[PDB]
């Protein structure tokens, strides 16, 4: 497994000590657990040894990988300057997206200040979007923006619903509060307010 | 605080929502106060409530509303008592707020379906009683007296034309009258009345009791005697006991009448405590076929309650006191009971205000049976007039005056 | 009447139950007509509130005269908490319908509103790990051979040897409930003794079969197993019935006894690809009724198997047609069910099984050259080797031959 | 082929089963035969294949006859017999497809089962109905009705002349209608319609339930209300529950009606699964007084075959009727067949001649509502029965038998306006 450029010349016990001491940031020692594993290491034993449970180890590895896939592409350094203390659980839900739409989803999820549930559902609006090729008003929501994918989900879930009843309208108002294009906005305005 | 007030959150279909009204202590911002309520009432980032909307109360200073969502997972299936400790257990004692009142709750369908709901419900209850096309009538027996004489009063009133007769809510079992005998003598009164008139008549026997076992014994005896309906105080006895009785009733085919004694302690003051519409929803989920809602002869709030406990779906409308759209997922409604300050002069209004799906519990007639007669006539006259197309809020005076000439019992009532 | 049970513009509600069917219409019958007919027969054959609606029809790619139909059913049509009612309505008589040559049910979406009316597994995956105090690995077990003709004492000895040797569970043969040559009461006593004298220093058990001819007999057997301190019991739900299964599941929750479910008849219902009910449907139905463990069978189509394994373990599964999942299914925090792999497996295949199923599973094995305890040892060793290797990040498919105390060697040497 | 013996004679205590199968190319019938026996039974405890006769006409299609020792089965348990014979034998690679066609239950095993709670003769005596087939119908609208209006429909139909009215098999207890209320209103309808005609009438109250306890509660309530008959779905609910209910019924004197919903899942295709006649025998052993068989006019020989298997005391093997083995029922009572599906009075002649007197006909839309409906069927049946007794040919004169009766009955005359 690949090791960072700093710890290239340590042994297994050096890895163990830097893990048990937290003597780095998470994206600096998450690759290390992976290399350490190859030299005889088990996570249940590591709970006795370092002291991080297996679910946390997996979350850390996947989060560091997602963060690398983000930083290696077009971006601005503010969000990587924000993913420094406690960004693993949020990076763990966008792992479903390919590298292109990943950097687009990160902006949405950190600007609206969303938690794991919203991130899981949002990546899903994006993953479900492509296989609805034929629908009512599908090409009016663009694909390269996450807000419009989520807005399309909400709109279709309220589209053939009960006559208003403040249920269809409520989902329409949810859809209008997240869309970020202009065709989406004037279409949802055509729908919710006046033919 | 900022981990609770989240101004950009859209509630999920599975969230329980609550609307609170509050007045913050001087020096405390409305948003911080809203965040605090969500925090005190919840917590693991999926086990916390979120405050998603805060707005001022129009026309009032230091008075705000806050809307808080709570994840479905926090509520025990089928349990009103768990919902209440979670929502109202400690927020009312919170130091940064001067006063706090709970105005409304949206129960997500996912949670509504875990509750029994009313034992029988409005449509079933009409079929069981075989009474259609009108509101039902009853009264409370005065003096509020031996079991034999009590039974005679019950007989005469039911025989005279009322559908139901009620026990005083404060008499369970006392040295001067023990429940076992009240039950025997009342049952006789009912049976004679039914045999004589050919109709179905009942009596709201009070089965409120100090213990669960005693409550069941009273309920079981009422069933043994063939009583179609029983009464219980859901607030004093509480929800564990109420729910238990409701389950018993559904299994055994007995209708349940719920009295609202002590609600004033909880909701009379407009700026603190729990609004009765919340308690009314909670009761619909727990059990009860009939519920005292009281009469109006705030009108808007009253109308709000009535739809909330009867309709399958109620659209939000702040002018009627409904904060959230509520979908009852086909759970049956609760038949409202109007009471307090009513006699035949108010019959027109009561019929138009509540429609047919209601019970009117009347207070004293100058001539018992003549009382029952006067109300039975007044009601039928009002219902028929409504169906014909008369406006009961204006013509009500003439409808009653004409009806008063058909039966002198009614004239005697109208004359006073 | 023929149509209007097919409404192409309809969008399903969050509270609708959805079902996906595959069918082949009789020559002369249009796909849409057939779709509408399925919806009608399965729901009505204010009625608009009580009828199903076909909302989408599409051809099966690559197959002649083969179509899919997606039908919604209103929540109000299903008895709360009852698998029996759901199936009675959906698969009651539509399969006998004359305009269709064949019909198969592929999937059901249970709306959250309905999911919450069911008990779900008595304990589920996380609770079971804690009850058993077994973490970080798949659990192991085996069946006992000889099957029939053994005295309760000899049977108990075989159970003893296998459990002491290193397995977590030993299973009763599905064909032995109570027989003239062996009566359940004695099997239960001798097995319980085998557990007692083995339970090592760790919790062990045996899947006592409590399948019985009547509801009373079933309880009687289950109660005896409880008196003896047995942590787990089993039941053949497709031969016994969902009513009986549900009853046993409630009993289990109240008494703290894990429940093992054995498919035991599924090949009758789901084997042929063009008729009947796909196993994944039955798997969902079972998760709602009860059961902590469920036989899934082994892998060693693959995609379809993986598909239902996630459906019965995960909280939220996104639709993915390539894995046989037609509808997104939200389980609303109902606990999952441990899959049990079995049939055609040996230590030889342990690497694959560990990588395929992960930790939340049970692997049941059917003999070893040296009695039985070395059998148990060989499996225990092979599993631990595989788990540790996977933890190290090794490739369990490519390095499987290297990843796999001469007990294990004897097994590997044999094959 | 250690499980295949070309020369073997079964013992009187052996259980026999007849399977039909199609081998994978490359697999001899002999091996497939032996494999079925091995997989289903595993020397005193192994099954033995003793005959592998090919089926005429079809290619790569064979039969296998397998004996199983008495000691492989739990006394009194259908669940066990099926688990042992059909549990996993349908799942192995040597065979492309497998279907179970028949089972011979040895007397020694038949006697360990309860059998029908009452049986055909007792059931007639309890109902005091003789000479003719019984009639019934169901109620439309099915879904969305209140218990009271439902009760009115029941009353009218029974008052009008039917013997039984049946609940929709799909409605146990639902948000729009709860079972307790249905039971009360139906019971009232029965009591009134019975009192006004002077004859016993019933309603097949559905006591299918999610748990064994709930099932009993529903059954107990029906008993308290004096209901003579209840119904249950033996396939969806399953045999453990069905057997329990049947035992309850015998103890309490309630007749049991069995619906066959979901049978199509198991027996619709002819080259895989379990033939209905097997399920019918299994049910006769488990319990149930009435069983849906389905009609013929609304394969004929195979249908008649199982109808005799579940009614007669002794049935000789006859392959042309789908009966593979001679079955001696050891004086266990039979099960009364119920015909249904696509039937109305036009088919009354055929139904009477096809099933004879020991049957129930479940009809259904009459032009003048429900009591006329019931009236028309009651008349059509009596007319057909009497003509058959006289010696008239129902398969040829049936058109005239109905028209003469129609002239007599305005209700029937309307019913025949087809």
Go through D396-411 and write b for each residue having 16 or more CB atoms within 10 A of its CB, e for each that does not: eebeebbeebbeebeb
**Could you tell me if D7 and D69 are in contact, meaning their C-beta atoms sit under 8 angstroms apart?**
no
Q: Bridge-partner residues for C233, per DSSP? A: C208, C259
Query: Most C CBs within 10 Å: which of B12, B46, B109, as the mutation test of the C interface?
Result: B109
Chain A residues within 8 A of B45 when measuring between CB atoms: 115-116
**Contacts of residue C89 in chain D, CB cutoff 8 Å?**
170
The two tokens of residue D74 are 């739990």
**Are D and A neighbours with ≥3 CB pairs closer than 8 A?**
no
Instruction: Using an 8 Å CB-CB cutoff, list chain C residues near B110.
Output: 112-113, 116, 332
CA dihedral C143→C144→C148→C150, nearest 10 degrees, is -150
Residues of C in contact with D71 (CB under 8 A): 179-181
- From the list B391, B360, B223, B241, the residue with the least C-alpha distance to B296 is B360
- Give φ, ψ of B331 to 5 degrees: -70, 140
Question: Which positions ≥6 away from C313 have C-beta within 8 Å?
Answer: C125, C336, C337, C338, C339, C360
In degrees, to the nearest 5, what angle opens at C-alpha D29 toward C-alphas D24 and D30?
Answer: 130
Distance from CA of B262 to the nearest CA of D (A): 33
Measured CB to CB, residues of chain B less than 8 Å from chain D are: 120, 123-124, 127-128, 250-251, 253, 329-331
Identify the bridge partners of residue B343 per DSSP, sorted by sequence position. none
Dig out the tokens for B321 from the structure: 């006191």
How many CB atoms within 10 Å of residue D340?
22
Any alpha helices (H) in B41-174, and if so which ranges? 80-88, 109-112, 122-129, 147-159
Q: What angle do CA B402, B406, B409 make, to 5 degrees?
A: 105
Say which of D259, D263, D275, D347 is annotated catalytic: D259
The answer to whether B143 and B170 are in contact (CB under 8 A) is: no
* CB-closest option in A165, A177, A178 to B315: A165
Which chains contact C through at least 3 pairs of Cβ atoms less than 8 Å apart? A, B, D
Binding partners of D (≥3 Cβ pairs within 8 A): B, C
- How remote is the C-alpha of C245 from its chain's centroid? 13
* B contact test, residue of D145, D151, D175, D225 with most B CBs within 10 A: D175
| Experimental technique | cryo-EM
Distance CA D11, CA D68 (A): 10
Cross-chain Cβ contact A166/B6 below 8 Å: no
CA distances C149 to A111, B31, B302, D66, Å, are 71, 76, 76, 20
Instruction: Count chain B–chain D contacts defined by CB atoms under 8 A.
Output: 20
Strand-pairing partners, residue C182, are C179
Distance from CA of C53 to the nearest CA of B (A): 19
- Lookup result for tokens 């129902």: D394
d(CA B106, CA B99): 22
CA D414 to chain centre: 32
Q: Identify which of D146, D184, D185 has the shortest CB distance to residue B123.
A: D146
Q: Measured between CA atoms, how close is C386 to chain A, in angstroms?
A: 11
Short-list C11, C180, C24, CA closest to C100: C24
Q: Is the peptide bond before B143 cis (omega within 30 degrees of 0)?
A: yes
Breaks (C-N over 2.5 A) in chain D follow: 42, 298, 364
Give the minimum alpha-carbon distance from B28 to chain C in angstroms, rounded to a whole number.
38
Contact B166, B203 (CB under 8 A): yes
CB contact under 8 A, D175 and B330: yes
What the block records as the tokens of D387 is 């003509």
Does the beta-carbon distance from C112 to B110 stay under 8 Å? yes
Q: How far apart are CA C366 and CA D180, in angstroms?
A: 50
A150 CB-near residues (< 8 Å, 6+ apart): A121, A122, A125, A126, A175, A178, A179
Is D169 annotated for ligand binding? yes
Q: Which chain C residue is nearest to residue A156, measuring alpha carbons?
A: C11
CA atoms within 13 A on the CB side of D156: 15
Question: Residue D141: is the preceding peptide bond cis (ω within 30°)?
Answer: yes
The candidate with the shortest Cα–Cα distance to A1, out of A30, A39, A27, A34, is A34
**If you measure CA to CA, which chain A residue comes closest to B5?**
A113
Q: What is the SS3 assignment for C152?
A: helix
Residues of chain B contacting residue C80, judged by C-beta atoms under 8 Å apart: 113
Asked if B120 and B331 count as a contact pair (C-beta separation under 8 A), the reply is no
Give the separation between CA B49 and CA B18, rounded to whole angstroms. 10
Give, in order, the Cα–Cα distances in Å from C148 to each of B342, C305, D77, D107. 81, 32, 18, 23
Distance (Å) of CA C336 to CA B95, C229, C288, C363, C371: 43, 24, 10, 17, 36
Q: Are C109 and C329 in contact (CB under 8 A)?
A: yes
Note if D192 is an active site residue.
Answer: no
Q: Is residue D215 within 8 Å of D238, Cβ to Cβ?
A: no
Six-digit token pair at B253? 């085919």
Distance of CA A189 to the CA centre of its chain: 29
CA B59 to chain centre: 30
d(CA D14, CA D71) in angstroms, rounded, equals 9
- Tell how many helices (H) and how many strands (E) occur in chain D: 15, 15
List of chain C residues whose C-beta atoms are within 8 Å of the C-beta of residue D142: 44
CA distance C37 to chain B (A): 27
Q: How far is CA B341 from CA A115, B338, B344, B350, in A?
A: 54, 10, 10, 12
Distance, CA of D325 to CA of D322 (rounded, Å): 9
What gap in Å lies between CA C173 and CA B225, rounded to an integer? Answer: 55
Structure tokens at D254: 């309630």
Per the CB < 8 A criterion, the answer to whether C390 and C350 are in contact is no
Please provide residue B91's backbone torsions phi and psi, each rounded to the nearest 5 degrees: -65, -30
- Say what the resolution is, in angstroms: 3.1
Other C-beta atoms lying within 10 Å of the C-beta of residue C108? 23
Sign of the CA dihedral running C387, C391, C397, C398: negative
Pick from B351, D238, B296, B67: nearest CA to C264: D238
How far apart are the C-alpha atoms of B377 and B396, rounded to whole Å? 13
> How far apart are the C-alpha atoms of B209 and A107, rounded to whole Å?
61
The pair of three-digit structure tokens given for residue B362, joined into one six-digit string = 């009347």
Q: Which of B113, B250, B329 to mutate to test the interface with C (most CBs of C within 10 A)?
A: B113
Q: Residue D356: count other Cβ atoms within 10 Å of its Cβ.
A: 13
Q: Report the distance separating Cα B272 and Cα B265, nearest Å.
A: 10
Q: Quick one: tokens of C394?
A: 């090794």
SS3 of D332, please? coil
Residues of C in Cβ contact (< 8 Å) with D86: 265, 268
Q: Which residue ranges of C are tagged as binding site for substrate?
A: 93, 143, 147, 263, 295, 342
* Helix (H/G/I), strand (E/B), else coil: D363: strand
Residues 6+ apart with CB under 8 A from C169: C139, C140, C141, C142, C163, C204, C205, C206, C207, C232, C362, C364
C-beta of residue B165 within 8 angstroms of C-beta of residue B138: yes
B13 contacts in chain C (CB < 8 Å): 14
DSSP labels for B188-241? HHHHHHHHHHSS--EEEEE---SSHHHHHHHHHHHHHTT-SEEEEETTTT-HHH
Strands C338-342 and C362-365: parallel
Is B263 annotated in the active site? no
**Alpha-carbon gap, residue B404 to B383, rounded angstroms:** 15
DSSP code at position C111: P
Beta bridge partner(s), residue C143: C171
Q: In angstroms, what separates the C-alpha of A74 from chain C's closest C-alpha?
A: 29
Mutate to test the interface with B, among C112, C114, C119 (most CBs of B within 10 A): C112
What pairing do the DSSP bridges indicate for beta strands D255-259 and C276-277?
Answer: unpaired
Q: Please indicate if any CB of chain A lies within 8 Å of the CB of B315.
A: yes
D133 in Cβ contact with D359 (< 8 Å): yes
């Amino acid at each position: 497994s690949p090791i960072p450029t700093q710890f290239r010349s340590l042994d297994s016990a050096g890895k163990i000590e830097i893990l048990a001491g937290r003597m780095a940031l998470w994206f600096e020692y998450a690759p290390l657990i992976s290399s350490l594993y190859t030299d005889g290491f088990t996570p249940p034993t590591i709970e006795e040894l370092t002291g991080i449970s297996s679910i946390e180890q997996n979350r850390l590895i996947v989060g560091a990988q997602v963060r690398d896939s983000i930083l290696q592409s077009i971006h601005e350094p503010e969000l990587i300057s924000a993913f420094d203390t406690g960004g693993a659980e949020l990076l763990y839900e966008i792992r479903l997206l390919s590298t292109t739409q990943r950097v687009a989803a990160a902006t949405f999820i950190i600007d609206r200040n969303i938690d794991s549930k919203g991130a899981q559902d949002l990546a899903r609006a994006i993953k479900d979007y492509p296989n609805r090729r034929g629908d009512v008003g599908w090409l009016d929501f663009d694909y390269n923006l996450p807000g419009d994918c989520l807005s399309f989900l909400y709109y279709r879930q309220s589209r053939e619903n009960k006559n208003p009843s403040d249920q269809r309208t409520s989902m329409l108002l949810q859809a209008l509060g997240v869309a970020e294009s202009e065709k989406a906005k004037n279409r949802l305005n055509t729908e919710l307010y006046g033919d | 605080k900022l981990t609770y007030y989240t101004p950009d959150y859209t509630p999920k279909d599975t969230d329980l929502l609550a609307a609170f009204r509050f007045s913050p202590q001087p020096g405390v911002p409305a948003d911080e106060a809203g965040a605090a309520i969500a925090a005190e009432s919840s917590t693991m980032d999926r086990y916390k409530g979120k405050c998603y909307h805060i707005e001022p109360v129009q026309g009032e200073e230091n008075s705000y509303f806050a809307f808080i969502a709570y994840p479905l997972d926090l509520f025990e299936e089928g349990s009103v008592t768990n919902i209440l400790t979670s929502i109202v257990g400690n927020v009312f004692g919170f130091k940064a707020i001067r006063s706090l009142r709970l105005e409304d709750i949206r129960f997500p369908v996912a949670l509504v379906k875990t509750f029994q709901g009313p034992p029988h419900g409005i449509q079933v209850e009409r079929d069981l009683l075989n009474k259609y096309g009108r509101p039902m009538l009853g009264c409370t027996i005065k003096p509020k007296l031996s079991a034999k004489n009590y039974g005679r009063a019950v007989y005469e009133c039911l025989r005279g034309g009322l559908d139901f007769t009620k026990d005083d809510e404060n008499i369970n079992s006392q040295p001067f009258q023990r429940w076992r005998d009240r039950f025997l003598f009342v049952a006789d009164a009912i049976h004679k009345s039914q045999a004589e008139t050919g109709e179905i008549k009942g009596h709201y026997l009070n089965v409120t009791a100090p213990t669960c076992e005693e409550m069941m014994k009273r309920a079981e005896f009422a069933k043994e005697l063939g009583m179609p309906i029983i009464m219980h105080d859901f607030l004093t006895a509480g929800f564990t006991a109420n729910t238990t009785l409701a389950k018993w009733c559904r299994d055994n085919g007995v209708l349940l009448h719920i009295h609202r004694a002590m609600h004033a302690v909880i909701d009379r003051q407009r700026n603190h405590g729990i609004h009765f519409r919340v308690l009314a929803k909670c009761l619909r989920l727990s059990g009860g076929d009939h519920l005292h809602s009281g009469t109006v002869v705030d009108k808007a709030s009253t109308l709000g309650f009535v739809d909330l406990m009867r309709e399958d779906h109620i659209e939000a409308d702040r002018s009627r006191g409904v904060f959230f759209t509520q979908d009852w997922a086909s759970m049956p409604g609760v038949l409202p009971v109007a009471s307090g300050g009513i006699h035949v002069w108010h019959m027109p209004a009561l019929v138009e205000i509540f429609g047919d799906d209601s019970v009117l519990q009347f207070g004293g007639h100058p001539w018992n049976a003549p009382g029952a007669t006067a109300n039975r006539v007044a009601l039928e006259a009002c219902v028929q007039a409504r169906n014909e197309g008369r406006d009961l809020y204006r013509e009500g005076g003439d409808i009653l005056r004409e009806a008063g000439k058909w039966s002198p019992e009614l004239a005697a009532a109208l004359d006073l």
